[PDB]
Design a protein around this ligand. Structure first.
Ligand SMILES: CC(=O)NS(=O)(=O)c1ccc(N/C=C2\C(=O)Nc3ccc4ncsc4c32)cc1
Length: 275
């Protein structure tokens, strides 16, 4: 760590604090994250999980029982860009570009059996060229519950890649409407917000749901809402895609690879954002 000079704190993340830092032996500006043999080996697998839409893990430094991760630095996160764009809205072509790029990133991770597990606007980083990148991919193997898939909330311990599709669908809806889709402030508030919008799940729409660990037969039974009410003014292609990303049954939920082939992306482009 004597090779790095901290510049500024850029995040109080889930796995540790992140700093903007300067590498004295190359002049490189990086994101330095200050965090057992199992962890060293899993984190070393992530050094090879390289893709243009995944924030690059430059180095892993284990010293004095402390673990530091050296990452590529990007100047803004999607949380800030959404806040800066709240009065006007992110233009649809840019929403579409960001969603497309994030699906490419997830399709890549998922093809290597790597899950993110905690997608949220705070760990989606953007640059001036129009790129968006996923940060903290693989580290999971007040914390926000807003983007949590219902199977996690219902106690599934062996959840799948579908959890990341759910989170990304929540983020897509939030870019379009300029408001979080399900801003729960407890696990039950989170689950009940999901149920009030998408209907209380049952054995018809989600076979096996009633036998999940935290499922309660006493859950209130809410009727489902139309997506035309939930994400106006998103067009029919976008609503169709979103509905497939928010299917209750993780097995029915669209995969990242199938989402990339959805007609919503027929006219996708790569606009440059106003930062
Ligand atoms: C500074 C602030 O609060 N918001 S911001 O200006 O929008 C802003 C600016 C810069 C950043 N970078 C964040 C990171 C970065 O560059 N690589 C990583 C790698 C891992 C990682 N795990 C959590 S975060 C993060 C970053 C974020 C926000």
């Amino acid at each position: 760590m004597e090779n790095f000079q901290k510049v500024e704190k850029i995040g109080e993340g889930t796995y540790g604090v992140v700093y903007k830092a300067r590498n004295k032996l190359t002049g490189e500006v990086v994101a330095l994250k200050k965090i057992p043999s199992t962890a060293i080996r899993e984190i070393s697998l992530l050094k090879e999980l390289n893709h243009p839409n995944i924030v690059k893990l430059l180095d892993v430094i284990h010293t004095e029982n402390k673990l530091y991760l050296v990452f590529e630095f990007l100047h803004q996160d999607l949380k800030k860009f959404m806040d800066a764009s709240a009065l006007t809205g992110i233009p649809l072509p840019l929403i579409k570009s960001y969603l497309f790029q994030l699906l490419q990133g997830l399709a890549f991770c998922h093809s290597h059996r790597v899950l993110h597990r905690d997608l949220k606007p705070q760990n989606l980083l953007i640059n001036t060229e129009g790129a968006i990148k996923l940060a903290d991919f693989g580290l999971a193997r007040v914390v926000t519950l807003w983007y949590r898939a219902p199977e996690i909330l219902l106690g599934c311990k062996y959840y799948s890649t579908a959890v990341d599709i759910w989170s990304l669908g929540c983020i897509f809806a939030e870019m379009v409407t300029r408001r979080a889709l399900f801003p729960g402030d407890s696990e039950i508030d989170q689950l009940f917000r999901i149920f009030r919008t998408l209907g209380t799940p049952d054995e018809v729409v989600w076979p096996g749901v009633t036998s999940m660990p935290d499922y309660k037969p006493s859950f209130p039974k809410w009727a489902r809402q139309d997506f035309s009410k939930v994400v106006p003014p998103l067009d029919e292609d976008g609503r169709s895609l979103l509905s497939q990303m928010l299917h209750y049954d993780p097995n029915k939920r669209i995969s990242a690879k199938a989402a990339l082939a959805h007609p919503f992306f027929q006219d996708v482009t790569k606009p440059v954002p106003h930062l």
